[PDB]
Design a protein around this ligand. Structure first.
Ligand code: ZN
Lengths: 243, 227, 282, 49, 109, 56, 48, 93, 97, 227
RNA sequence: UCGA
């Protein structure tokens, strides 16, 4: 089978950041950049400070320069690139990018100004400098100007983007998914057989039982212990009642 | 006043559109919505299905071919084929390539109402003695329909492939401060259209504005109510 | 959205009349939110400039691109003279329109301090008790929706330079660097034995960890209050002081597998990076 | 279940020094280990998704 | 050696949802015996304690409860999910056991 | 046999669904909140959607 | 100690072969596993 | 949530009593197939479907909306369980 | 292990000046006990820091900026990896690939 | 397919409009243009400046009157009027108040073609022997123009006021995925609209979409310049 | 022996 990436499939980077696929969004609406090139993923920053993995931040930072400069990078463990060097790479990359911009018969977007204003007020970029130097000082920081594809008005603040190496993990929904109504039962006791293989139903744990007792749902727990599990005529007469 | 509208054309691929002046911030209000409809509903082709006499599936290897089946199919949907006939919903392309030659888009069998904008697109390399017979089937449609979603049933070994219609490669719109206008703080809208050449940037913007106006005219008389 | 911006640009400029400040904002001599004093009253450029007779006018003026949600202005809200930010009014409005009556809403919400983890929790409880279950449910989902979309529009990102190291890092580290040579001198002078020297060094690296942590928090509050890391920590989104400390200031002295604390501290942060030693020992 | 595939990287003819790569491997691009793909990430909360 | 006021979280955890065992008099207001203490009530007893009027709060407890094989409303008090006096038939032993069981994953520091 | 799943059955399913809710459980079950009743909503994908608030 | 090879990718097997386990016959069991075996000794370094 | 749940919780001492009420009443509504209902045409809970808008087949919801009016009656040992089913299955098929 | 425990091993990140030691403060240890050691007393140095980590762990760029937990998780996850048809080599890699 | 349009309103102020169903991605495409236009467009009311007797500064208080000058200005901002003819885009209103009184927008002296649609609005409270005379200036603009962006003094010492032009107070749209048969991918687009009462949400919205297609028709006549 |  050819399995194409689905909704709810495991994904990760080398830096230990996991997650599944939540609602693949249409290419139409994407937080793109001035060139009109949409972003492929859009991860959530929240997981970053807790995990304390800044390797993904630096991978993104290097990738941001790599997308433009068109060259990969080699950074060995505990030997390699530093902030000044990376910032230099981003400086060169920006110097070429903005060059293609002004060279294609364009200039600073009004939305870019809209972001640069508040970026200047919060002290992210040095005031008094032209929007060239401001968007430059913003660029090497890893942050750039992003336009929301849904609306078309930019985001009120800059957003770090770039090339991150991301891995598609083993676990997939096509496999891990399962469910059952009626089917196989153990020979010893009339309980079903847990797992996708035997095509059985889930097991209700002792603590799940405890939870049900805590809610005080009598017939729910009663059904769990009898009607849908090991009861001889329970599941039968039930099935007939529903039918 | 009356906004000046200009169009800077390059080939069937690149295009530029400058509409100025406009109200403050009003450039986005127009420019982005068109971008969405442009990047979504523009009709296109990117083939449909393929067949080879030596091939039972997207895997099985063809003698004298470096690229496997789905490896070629990777480059099959990347082929732009323009239909000159507005009434043509279907076609079939034929390819015969033998010996030590590198095939391509321009190596197919030319037919009426069809042309390829990138003959330099590399299909598969063929070594000495390697012989290949290929036939495809191309249909026109809208958006992106996965191979799994569409059936073919051309014959016993028919292989459906993904379809990216969307003749526009990318759209980038940007607003600036236009010198035109009685007042300041106005916007010059520059919309940049990048397409494959199945449809020119101008035509793309045309049918885009058409879909836009159409869907805009769905606003006719609603059924009222007052809680 | 509820966070109120304050710039030190203007820095308490006292004038005779509103006109001086009026022109002062134009000349760029005073910030929009700068805490100045006009006439005899303490106010800001924003508190004067933007004056609204109702929320709708405020939201229109702001969303038309003439203002920011975090700027301090004057507004008439429910027969009041309240001087606050459009984001605050927006908050109260969301809660009120979610519950269906903004009287009890604006009654039970704090209109002063920025909304966060704690305050929001208190709001949810107070809602569930004063209002009732269904109302609190729809309220919760409203907070979810609006809050989510606000987080989206904010475009809060994490770069390396959002981790910015306190300038007093180098200082406080080199001072302790001399202090080590001090304690060691004591050890060699016979004043300190092995164990007491050890203890002195331990409390030294501990107090240095304190110096740099305090340095981190102060560097955030004084300089970059709008920093995403600091905001995530304060608001209660993600992170704790120690995590940020290890991501900004020093990661702190480690612990030997024997169960006893180590000798040499790890020094450099995660945004700095650790040598082979510091990582292994960690 | 993961497929093992070796993609020939060599042209119909050319010189090859000893140790030089000819085919490929499932995780191999040109002789460099490739697990996933390099994509464009944007760090930002998006609609609570 | 300075007797200090237990932080309001502790006093909440103690007095919230509790029922008065006997009448209480503080600050001119009076708490009737059998009144279920809400957050407001607990905070008031905090105010009165800061005023130094009440150093102890009489409360009906599961310990003191004479309900055979279980507890009773007036001894238990509020059902913590619904913020009202506990429903009869509610098994509070299981709920309690789970409530203690949940934090069991984090204790190190 | 033959999963056609005609639209008729997609709608009929909802005809027996709406108004009834199914329990969702997350292991480990420690708090009783580890099991909560949720209204089934027929949706594409093989993944199960859960509300972000109760995820805590 | 002898079980299904990891073919999930070349590096999967490549690492799988280089792993060191204190479990299995002749080794220890989870019931007896203490912080001594779980800890990284000062002499681990470039060995493990 | 279920509309009127606060009121319903307020209608009885123990929430479990409410649950029992709703359960038994929904059961009764299933037995006679909604023909025993205390609800008028505008009161009938209706589910909207592409085919057509009909009365919501879910009996539980029907019981909820029913007791919401309070036109029903409940209590311990209200009437003999004997005649309870004799004149029940009688009045309605 | 014992052999190593005898001598004093410097670090691969030490100030190599072109085959000689540069600064008079050299990072070195004994038995696993980090110490600042003069260019005299140093009898040994490790080849590359890479030796301190396994394959998958060594395949993580900017490893010094990630917590031990998440690094562990990533390196452990590289085993869970599955082949992709179009799969591409990482932009920033340790070069051990 | 064929999107159905529905409208549920109340009064001349509140209105709500739903396009059910719609193609995926389109709801958001429609939402912003209508929103951005409605707030930045749709000409109307908003008195520009105000003159007051015995009052020069916008600050110094007015004796005999309860509320100070500021509060009065603010109450004047909430006032809404309407012109019966396009010929008059600007006019002036008069108010002379004496003795103890409650001064409303009804107490406001009328004008030729000007019809005040805000019959009862508290403006100023007059105490014993309260002396007040004021002249307000009303112009027809669009969007929102601050008192800063336009200075106006007709009388000796006048007070330029924030002009709140667009009768639309607050919009807001939303889009959700509705279910139809097999496909759940649809777009339900709901838009809520508040107005001052001068124009009903129907008129404001229809005018906005008119402005929209009007702006879209501006792509007609390209001028070819090749790069 | 992995997933959470
Ligand atoms: Zn008791």
């Amino acid at each position: 089978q050819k399995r194409k990436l689905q909704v709810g499939d495991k994904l990760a980077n080398r830096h230990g950041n996991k997650g599944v696929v939540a609602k693949i969004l249409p290419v139409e609406d994407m937080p793109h950049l001035p060139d009109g090139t949409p972003v492929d993923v859009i991860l959530n920053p929240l997981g970053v400070p807790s995990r304390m993995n800044l390797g993904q931040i630096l991978e993104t930072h290097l990738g941001l320069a790599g997308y433009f400069l068109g060259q990969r990078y080699i950074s060995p463990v505990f030997d390699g690139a530093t902030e000044p060097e990376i910032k230099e790479l981003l400086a060169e990359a920006f110097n070429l990018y903005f060059g293609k911009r002004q060279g294609e018969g364009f200039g600073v977007d009004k939305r870019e100004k809209e972001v640069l204003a508040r970026a200047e007020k919060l002290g992210l970029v040095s005031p008094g400098k032209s929007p060239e130097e401001q968007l430059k000082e913003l660029f090497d920081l890893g942050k750039v100007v992003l336009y929301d594809g849904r609306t078309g008005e930019p985001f009120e603040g800059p957003i770090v983007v770039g090339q991150m190496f991301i891995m598609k993990l083993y676990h997939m929904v096509e496999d891990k998914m399962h469910a059952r109504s009626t089917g196989p039962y153990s020979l010893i006791t009339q309980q079903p057989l847990g797992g996708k293989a035997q095509f059985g139903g889930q097991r209700f744990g002792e603590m799940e039982v405890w939870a049900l007792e805590a809610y005080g749902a009598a017939h729910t727990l009663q059904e769990m212990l009898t009607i849908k599990s090991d009861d001889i005529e329970g599941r039968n007469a039930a099935y007939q009642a529903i039918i | 006043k009356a906004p000046v509208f200009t169009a800077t054309t390059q080939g069937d691929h690149y295009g530029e559109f400058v509409l100025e002046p406009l109200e403050r911030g009003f450039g986005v209000t127009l420019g982005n919505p068109l971008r969405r409809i442009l990047l979504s509903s523009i009709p296109g082709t990117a083939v449909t299905s393929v067949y080879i006499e030596d091939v039972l599936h997207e895997f099985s290897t063809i003698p004298g071919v470096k690229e496997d089946v789905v490896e070629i199919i990777l480059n099959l949907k990347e082929l732009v084929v323009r239909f000159l006939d507005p009434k043509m919903a279907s076609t079939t392309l034929i390819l015969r390539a033998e010996g030590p030659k590198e095939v391509r888009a321009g190596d197919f069998t030319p037919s009426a109402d069809v042309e390829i904008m990138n003959p330099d697109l590399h299909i598969a390399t063929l070594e000495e003695g390697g012989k290949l017979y290929m036939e495809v089937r191309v249909d026109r449609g809208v958006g992106y329909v996965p191979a799994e979603r569409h059936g073919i049933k051309d014959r016993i070994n028919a292989i459906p492939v993904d379809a990216i219609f969307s003749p526009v490669r990318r759209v980038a719109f940007q607003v600036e401060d236009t010198r035109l206008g009685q007042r300041t703080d106005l916007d010059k809208l520059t919309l940049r259209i990048w397409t494959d050449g199945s449809v020119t940037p101008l035509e793309a913007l045309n049918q885009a504005v058409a879909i836009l106006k159409e869907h805009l005219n769905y606003f006719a008389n609603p059924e009222a109510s007052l809680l | 959205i509820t966070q109120v911006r304050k710039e030190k640009k203007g820095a308490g400029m006292a004038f005779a009349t509103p006109e001086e400040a009026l022109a002062a904002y134009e000349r760029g001599e005073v910030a929009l939110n700068a805490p100045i004093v006009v006439a005899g009253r303490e106010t800001s450029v924003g508190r004067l400039k933007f004056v609204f007779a109702n929320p709708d006018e405020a939201l229109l003026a702001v969303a038309h691109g003439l203002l920011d949600l975090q700027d301090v202005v004057t507004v008439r809200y429910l027969g009041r003279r309240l001087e606050t930010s459009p984001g605050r009014i927006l908050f109260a409005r969301i809660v009120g329109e979610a519950v269906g009556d903004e009287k009890v809403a604006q009654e039970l919400i704090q209109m002063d301090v920025p909304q966060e983890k704690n305050s929001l929790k208190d709001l949810v409880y107070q809602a569930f008790l004063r209002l009732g279950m269904e109302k609190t449910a729809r309220l919760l989902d409203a907070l979810k929706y609006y809050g989510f979309t606000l987080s989206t529009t904010s475009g809060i990102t994490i770069g390396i330079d959002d981790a910015v190291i306190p300038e007093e890092k180098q200082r406080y580290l080199e001072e302790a660097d001399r202090k080590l040579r001090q304690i060691e001198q004591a050890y060699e002078m016979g004043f300190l034995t092995d164990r007491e020297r050890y203890d002195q060094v331990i409390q030294l690296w501990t107090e240095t960890t304190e110096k740099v942590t305090q340095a981190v928090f102060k560097n955030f509050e004084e300089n970059y209050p709008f920093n995403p890391l600091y905001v995530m920590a304060q608001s209660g989104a993600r992170g704790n002081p120690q995590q940020i400390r290890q991501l900004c200031g020093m990661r702190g002295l480690m612990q030997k597998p024997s169960g006893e604390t180590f000798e040499v501290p790890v020094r450099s942060s995660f945004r700095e990076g650790l040598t082979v030693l510091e990582y292994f020992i960690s | 279940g993961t497929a093992f595939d070796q993609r020939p990287r060599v042209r119909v003819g050319q010189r090859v020094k000893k140790g030089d790569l000819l085919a490929d491997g499932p995780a191999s691009e040109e002789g460099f280990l490739a697990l996933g793909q390099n994509v464009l990430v944007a760090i930002m909360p998006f609609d609570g998704y | 050696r300075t007797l200090r006021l237990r932080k309001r979280s502790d006093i909440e955890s103690g007095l919230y949802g509790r029922v008065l065992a006997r009448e209480v008099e503080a600050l001119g207001r009076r708490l009737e015996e059998g009144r279920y203490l809400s957050l407001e009530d607990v905070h008031f007893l905090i105010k009165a304690a800061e005023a130094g009027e009440v150093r102890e709060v009489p409360v009906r407890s599961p310990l003191t409860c004479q309900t055979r094989y279980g507890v009773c409303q007036k001894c238990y008090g509020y059902d913590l999910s619904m913020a009202r006096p506990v429903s009869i038939g509610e098994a509070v032993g299981v709920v309690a056991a789970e409530s203690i069981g949940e934090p069991g994953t984090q204790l190190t520091m | 046999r033959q999963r056609d799943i005609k639209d008729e059955v997609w709608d009929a399913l909802e005809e027996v669904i709406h108004g009834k809710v199914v329990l969702l459980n997350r292991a480990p079950t420690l708090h009783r909140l580890g099991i909560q009743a949720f209204q089934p909503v027929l949706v594409e994908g093989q993944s199960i959607q859960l509300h972000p608030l109760v995820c805590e | 100690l002898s079980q299904f090879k990891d073919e999930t990718n070349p590096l999967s097997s490549l690492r799988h072969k280089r792993r060191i386990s204190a479990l299995g016959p002749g080794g220890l069991t989870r019931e007896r596993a203490g912080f001594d075996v779980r800890d990284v000794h000062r002499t681990h370094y470039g060995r493990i | 949530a279920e509309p009127g749940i606060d009121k319903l919780f307020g209608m009885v001492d123990s929430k479990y009593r409410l649950t029992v009420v709703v359960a038994k009443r929904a059961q009764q509504l299933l037995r006679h197939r909604f023909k025993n209902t205390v609800l008028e045409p505008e009161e009938r809970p209706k589910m909207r479907t592409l085919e057509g808008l009909y009365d919501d087949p879910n009996a539980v919801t029907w019981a909820m909306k029913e007791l919401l009016t309070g036109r029903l009656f409940f209590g311990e040992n209200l009437v003999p369980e004997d005649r309870l089913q004799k004149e029940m299955e009688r009045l309605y098929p | 292990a014992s052999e190593e425990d005898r001598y004093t091993i410097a670090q691969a990140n030490t100030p190599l000046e072109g085959d000689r030691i540069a600064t008079d403060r050299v990072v070195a240890r004994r038995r696993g006990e980090p110490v600042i050691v003069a260019p005299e007393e140093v009898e040994f140095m490790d080849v590359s820091p890479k030796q301190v980590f396994s394959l998958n762990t060594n395949l993580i760029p900017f490893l010094e900026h990630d917590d031990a937990n998440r690094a562990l998780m990533g390196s452990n996850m590289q085993t869970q990896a599955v082949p992709l048809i179009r799969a591409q080599a990482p932009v920033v890699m340790t070069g051990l690939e």
